[PDB]
Design an enzyme around this catalytic site. Structure first.
Site, PDB file in Angstrom:
ATOM      1  N   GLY A  44      -4.831 -19.430 -11.283  1.00  0.00           N
ATOM      2  CA  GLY A  44      -3.777 -20.331 -11.064  1.00  0.00           C
ATOM      3  C   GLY A  44      -4.315 -21.207 -10.268  1.00  0.00           C
ATOM      4  O   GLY A  44      -4.058 -22.569 -10.557  1.00  0.00           O
ATOM      5  N   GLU A  86      -5.009 -25.280 -11.605  1.00  0.00           N
ATOM      6  CA  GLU A  86      -3.898 -26.116 -11.268  1.00  0.00           C
ATOM      7  C   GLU A  86      -4.671 -27.249 -10.360  1.00  0.00           C
ATOM      8  O   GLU A  86      -4.272 -28.254 -10.364  1.00  0.00           O
ATOM      9  CB  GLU A  86      -2.728 -25.443 -10.450  1.00  0.00           C
ATOM     10  CG  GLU A  86      -1.753 -24.764 -11.639  1.00  0.00           C
ATOM     11  CD  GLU A  86      -0.899 -23.971 -10.782  1.00  0.00           C
ATOM     12  OE1 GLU A  86      -0.010 -24.504 -10.034  1.00  0.00           O
ATOM     13  OE2 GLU A  86      -0.556 -22.758 -11.325  1.00  0.00           O
ATOM     14  N   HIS A 100      -8.224  -8.239  -1.071  1.00  0.00           N
ATOM     15  CA  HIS A 100      -9.046  -7.307  -1.113  1.00  0.00           C
ATOM     16  C   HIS A 100     -10.226  -7.531  -1.232  1.00  0.00           C
ATOM     17  O   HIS A 100     -11.323  -7.101  -0.834  1.00  0.00           O
ATOM     18  CB  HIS A 100      -8.466  -6.237  -2.076  1.00  0.00           C
ATOM     19  CG  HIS A 100      -9.254  -5.031  -2.426  1.00  0.00           C
ATOM     20  ND1 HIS A 100     -10.458  -5.033  -2.928  1.00  0.00           N
ATOM     21  CD2 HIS A 100      -9.356  -3.830  -1.710  1.00  0.00           C
ATOM     22  CE1 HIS A 100     -11.169  -3.940  -3.113  1.00  0.00           C
ATOM     23  NE2 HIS A 100     -10.342  -3.006  -2.206  1.00  0.00           N
ATOM     24  N   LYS A 144     -13.689  -2.463   6.776  1.00  0.00           N
ATOM     25  CA  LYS A 144     -13.926  -3.825   6.261  1.00  0.00           C
ATOM     26  C   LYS A 144     -13.749  -5.017   7.387  1.00  0.00           C
ATOM     27  O   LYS A 144     -14.245  -6.060   7.178  1.00  0.00           O
ATOM     28  CB  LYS A 144     -12.788  -4.095   5.391  1.00  0.00           C
ATOM     29  CG  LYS A 144     -12.882  -3.055   4.122  1.00  0.00           C
ATOM     30  CD  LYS A 144     -11.461  -2.940   3.287  1.00  0.00           C
ATOM     31  CE  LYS A 144     -11.847  -2.332   1.953  1.00  0.00           C
ATOM     32  NZ  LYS A 144     -10.540  -1.706   1.412  1.00  0.00           N
TER      33      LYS A 144
END
Ligand SMILES: NC(=O)c1ccc[n+]([C@@H]2O[C@H](COP(=O)([O-])OP(=O)(O)OC[C@H]3O[C@@H](n4cnc5c(N)ncnc54)[C@H](O)[C@@H]3O)[C@@H](O)[C@H]2O)c1
Ligand SMILES: NC(=O)c1ccc[n+]([C@@H]2O[C@H](COP(=O)([O-])OP(=O)(O)OC[C@H]3O[C@@H](n4cnc5c(N)ncnc54)[C@H](O)[C@@H]3O)[C@@H](O)[C@H]2O)c1
Ligand SMILES: NC(=O)c1ccc[n+]([C@@H]2O[C@H](COP(=O)([O-])OP(=O)(O)OC[C@H]3O[C@@H](n4cnc5c(N)ncnc54)[C@H](O)[C@@H]3O)[C@@H](O)[C@H]2O)c1
Ligand SMILES: NC(=O)c1ccc[n+]([C@@H]2O[C@H](COP(=O)([O-])OP(=O)(O)OC[C@H]3O[C@@H](n4cnc5c(N)ncnc54)[C@H](O)[C@@H]3O)[C@@H](O)[C@H]2O)c1
Lengths: 359, 359, 359, 359
Positions: free
Chosen positions: B131, B135, B286, B327
């Site tokens: 999106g 956009e 993620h 992470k």
């Protein structure tokens, strides 16, 4: 004195007489007996999200029981037929059902409820992000453990313990996954090279389901029942890691999105009606609801998620927003339950799917 | 009587003397003057999420100002160099910076703040869902309008008005997008067929950025500055729709995930340090945080999102959870602001990026 | 092939042409300059909660600037006149303004922004729960310190450190409060016994404001400006503890709710218009909004809170719910910002109250 | 090539072997049968908030089953004895139990579950805000109806329909309340004037419970079983309205907080152990937890609410924060379920209270 007349008039206005149902909970029995069926039946009249849970049970039952008479010359288009597995009860349906699940629901014990739905082909298409794909297979190799939300991640990392909420996946589980999947990726690439096979996420998930060959696995049952499973960001997780490391040992695998968006967006077009059950938000929610724009809207809809619409997110959007897009039909009466799914899905299954299967 | 001794002893315990900083807000001036810089400076000492916003400003400034002396024989590895666009100020940095944004942030006016960061190469890699890709291009063709959260979607659909939170995208905008993108997809497929080009989401987003050729577009600036943009579910949106309809007119386009997961997960490995700024949750969060496991953890981290960890979601996970996975590095001091991004990002930019660019 | 016609027709509907404003953020300057006033001005057009913050600034400015011509024979009823403190600028207003604050806002650095409003009589009535009453006085005796949300409470208790979010109140602060307040309660009980004084929460809070005699204190300024402060559960906190222990040393104090509900619910009845600014939820929100039913509704309304309506709570109720009760007038255009107040109140003050005071 | 060694080493770390329980849901039966008891038993091992619900059931069962041997010379201090109502089963307990409920829970069908607990004296002290006091009595006069969250409040007000979430209270219900309560307030004021009665919220709630004289009413059962009910902001609601209008017809009623804070804060001091079950937040949560500081902490604790701690609110504070204050004992193992109560309380009752009563 005399109370101000404006206050009297404003506090004590007249009211319309109403014939709508009344708020009323289940009354537990004075001897300690507890009737779960009456509990469940009264949720619709309890208020707040219990009421929405009752309405969601009603909405799913409308999906399961929808029927119609075909137009002259047409045959009836049915779903939920299954893959003819011996001993497995199936129940044909005129409404096609889409299930969306976030990855953490497979990490959780909801895996067992979801497996029940897929085993009996009580849903027809699933969309699940990559974590929920891989962790279903990993659980066939080694279990996920109970932990806690508040345990210092520095300590966990030093122990090789990956935290998912209040759950723990020992990193050894991912080494076992590597051992299992690398020969499969080798074979898939061999078939790409020698037979022209064109891999997509849904085709790969089908293949991994057959390979795990284990009735504990959700995606095994999906493959056996020819239930397509879409996951357009399939590399966003451990399968992505495995593809990464595999590709340095054996380069050339291609995983195509284009064929899978054709196939996903065509899934809603045949059925006389579609129902969508979306557990959680994110990609799985948008992917299913957008596909249903292609038929000018889903006909039955349940959302269960913890998001809210104030942040403008797709995750948090009310069903009403999807109506504006054409993703939900103008005639639908959709339901959202504002709740964490592990508290909700078991009672949804008890009130709809299980009762249906028992007929 | 005499108060119970257990109550006296429990209510009036002795306390340790503390030398930590004190809670103190900015005092607006008694003549009506308002000093925004002192307001911003005091957020760190205001408590609750204002404090976290102040700490996040500090964390981003650590990314922007990190420096080191290379080991003997090495040269310094720098980032933020830009693409040599005339007149554009760039500022080389030893810390490589990843930006993740949910799609609705491009729908919002945050597009203008994000464009500022990308134009000046104040971030080096972006991950954005589909999106937010489309956009940004659509806004170069036709604007998004202000609306409201509570307007019946039945009425909006009958008017062809797609709602995004309290924003409205008239469906004509998507017809204009179709006109713009179909010749580009034709050319991309021609290059695939005749020159062997292997399309991936990041390569396509680069190409669309050059094609829009418009300084109002975020992804134009990303392409001009050679900032890679990843989006592994690029078909989950209107670009997916355009690929769908294009494919029936002109079949054969392939959009590969495998090359893009190699390239994404290699992005964090060269830099001496990495910083991650994640605005919203889902795939973009993620994808960036997992990539940084490949270097044994991101070194600087800011999250801004409206999620909470009680649902076990990846979106809602605290930085502490990412530490358990590797992470986030064991030495990092990450910051999460619990807030809707449109209320937060402008002050983050004022307090860090803008001040840095002005040096 | 040819794409399905139903998909073509559903995805590419025609749309109405709109004349509504466009979404557009502030564009930070390419040299690093940052214009806070243009930032603030564009919030209204940024979308999601930034837009609501802009609308809330507009709503408060309507309260501050409301004016009218009295009916023939009437004089104008004005508010915000102040208590004639030397050097303090006041600005008379035709709209009477109610402020509600949860206790933690006084724990936070918002205390300094709230003090600014009360010092200049920019609000006329305050409702604040007991924690916010006592901690304003305690901060005149000893400070509150910065801490963190995640520090084991077992360790803090053993050190006598009381946690409020990411703030710390050493328990010694409460021993200092005890020393300060016990002679005052003695005197109040003496006046009850010898002069017939009838204590209520608002009368006691007025007296404590005069006693602290310190310009750092919010409730000092309220008392000096004859701003009533209501707190119907005034015993729900440390003042309750002090009353408890005082009562065993010196029994007989009475703290009456009845006189204070007469006085609270009469507060909205004189003004030509009322505005309500509710920061947080709970008692302070219901007490103010219910009082305004007595005039058939508040005329201007801003809520800022982190609650949502899905749980049926009074805290989470949208302004629309209060309309159904008559607590908000049928003609009002209320605004809720979904946000943590420490991120919002400073910009509300900059955009409305401060600008007004500078005129 | 060869994958980077740092990536290999970071992704594939070794892990500790764990002996903790495994994540596992209930497996619904393949014939459609659904075993609610096995569903409930497996919640503890399902993850996320289902796990916390299982732990909360365990925590309440520890309250109900706690036992001890008195010290030499002491007798055993017991609770839950009841008021000797004919036919009502009671079960003496060595742990004293506090229940806190927000007002909307009485609006909802949870009223029937709460009534069950109070009727059988399965809790010993209740704290409930004013809405939950009055609406229990009003429901004995006229019912509350089912509605919806999204129905324009302008339309409802014009019809005299007060909205509470997705529930509707016709304003006539409050006129019926007025008719019922005004003669009682007259009598209470007569007793104040002629017999020296000193009214407090808890004493008034006891009296109203006896007056309603109706087994459908929660507070009737509380009065019959001599269960004290505290509500320090008892004027924050319709009872406050009734006191207001009554006072202009018949002035002089006094409602004292001081006697009630002595009595509330002394409630936890006799018992060998205390348990707290807090449903919702706000005043009822702080009032109960603060009282338990007076014994140096509650021993067993369950919170169920939809708040989060990021806003620093008392409502959102984790049990860990209360430990820092001494409101929860250092040895307790408290549980919070992050959920809307109507989805949770029925299963808590099934798993603990009902099973206990059936022994
Ligand atoms: N969570 C894991 O186990 C895991 C593991 C590997 C990779 N990932 C990856 O993270 C990415 C984002 O994860 P995701 O798409 O599953 O969604 P997410 O975790 O980003 O959740 C999206 C929204 O869905 C709602 N939600 C999530 N869990 C819920 C619950 N229990 N009950 C109610 N609502 C809930 C919440 O509003 C949340 O914000 C995916 O690409 C995924 O593959 C996740
Ligand atoms: N939103 C759109 O404009 C739009 C348009 C087309 C397609 N989609 C598709 O929907 C899918 C899911 O959307 P997504 O990945 O952007 O994330 P999302 O909308 O699912 O949000 C994920 C989480 O991020 C947090 N978040 C979202 N907005 C936030 C905000 N303003 N401030 C703070 N936190 C916020 C929230 O916790 C939310 O639950 C994507 O694949 C996307 O391409 C979105
Ligand atoms: N918090 C303290 O410092 C403290 C100290 C002593 C006593 N107490 C007592 O606790 C009881 C309950 O506290 P309360 O009435 O202040 O409200 P609360 O803390 O129960 O909050 C009510 C609701 O208001 C909203 N809210 C709270 N803080 C917010 C914030 N920063 N930003 C946006 N929304 C926010 C939230 O939705 C919250 O659930 C009171 O009686 C109080 O006296 C509090
Ligand atoms: N709600 C009504 O029916 C009603 C009627 C009259 C007066 N009032 C008055 O409003 C004031 C504030 O109301 P309150 O003290 O009952 O609390 P509240 O409605 O302010 O809620 C406090 C917090 O408790 C939590 N909560 C509320 N409902 C919940 C639910 N169903 N499940 C889980 N958590 C929930 C939420 O975090 C909420 O923010 C009271 O003084 C009350 O007397 C309420």
């Amino acid at each position: 004195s005399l109370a101000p007349s404006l206050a009297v008039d404003s506090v004590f206005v007249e009211s319309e007489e109403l014939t709508t149902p009344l708020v009323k909970g289940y009354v537990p029995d004075d001897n300690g007996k507890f009737d779960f069926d009456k509990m469940l039946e009264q949720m619709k009249y309890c208020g707040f999200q219990a009421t929405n849970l009752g309405l969601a049970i009603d909405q799913i039952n409308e999906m399961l029981h929808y029927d119609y008479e075909p137009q002259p010359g047409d045959e009836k288009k049915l779903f939920g037929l299954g893959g003819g597995v011996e001993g497995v009860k199936y129940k044909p349906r005129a409404c096609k059902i889409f299930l969306g699940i976030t990855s953490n629901l497979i990490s959780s014990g909801m895996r067992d409820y979801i497996r029940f739905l897929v085993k009996h082909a009580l849903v027809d298409v699933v969309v699940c992000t990559a974590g929920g794909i891989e962790e279903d297979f990993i659980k066939c190799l080694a279990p996920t453990h109970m932990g806690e939300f508040f345990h210092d991640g520095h300590d966990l990392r030093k122990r090789g313990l990956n935290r998912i909420g209040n759950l723990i996946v020992p990193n050894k589980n991912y080494c076992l996954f590597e051992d299992w999947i690398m020969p499969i990726l080798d074979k898939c690439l061999e078939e790409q090279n020698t037979q022209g096979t064109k891999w997509t996420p849904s085709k790969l998930i089908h293949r991994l389901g057959l390979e795990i060959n284990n009735e504990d696995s959700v995606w095994y049952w999906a493959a056996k029942n020819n239930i397509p499973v879409y996951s357009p960001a399939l590399t966003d997780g451990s399968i992505g890691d495995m593809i990464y490391f595999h590709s340095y040992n054996n380069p050339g695998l291609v995983l195509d999105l284009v064929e899978d968006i054709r196939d996903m967006n065509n899934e809603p077009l045949w059925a006389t009606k579609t129902g969508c059950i979306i557990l959680g938000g994110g990609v799985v929610k948008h992917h299913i609801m957008n596909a249903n724009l292609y038929r000018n809207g889903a006909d039955f809809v349940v959302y269960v998620n913890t998001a809210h619409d104030f942040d403008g997110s797709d995750s948090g959007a009310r069903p009403d927003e999807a109506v504006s897009w054409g993703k939900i039909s103008l005639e639908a009466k959709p339901v959202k339950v504002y709740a964490e799914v592990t508290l909700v899905l078991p009672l949804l299954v008890a009130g709809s799917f299980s009762k249906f299967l028992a007929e």
